[PDB]
């Protein structure tokens, strides 16, 4: 599924498969 990053995680959240899940979906960056 997919909500739009930063959304509310739980058991079960939509957030794309690109999203890691802790509070709200956060990004993701090397540099």
Same mark, same amino acid.
């Given at each position: 599924? +997919?909500?739009?990053? /930063?959304?509310? =995680?739980?058991?079960?959240?939509? =957030? +794309?498969?690109? @999203?890691? +899940?802790? @509070?709200? =979906?956060?990004? !993701? !960056?090397? /540099?």
């Amino acid at each position: 599924y +997919c909500q739009k990053w /930063m959304w509310t =995680c739980d058991e079960e959240r939509k =957030c +794309c498969e690109g @999203l890691v +899940c802790r @509070l709200w =979906c956060k990004r !993701i !960056i090397n /540099m």
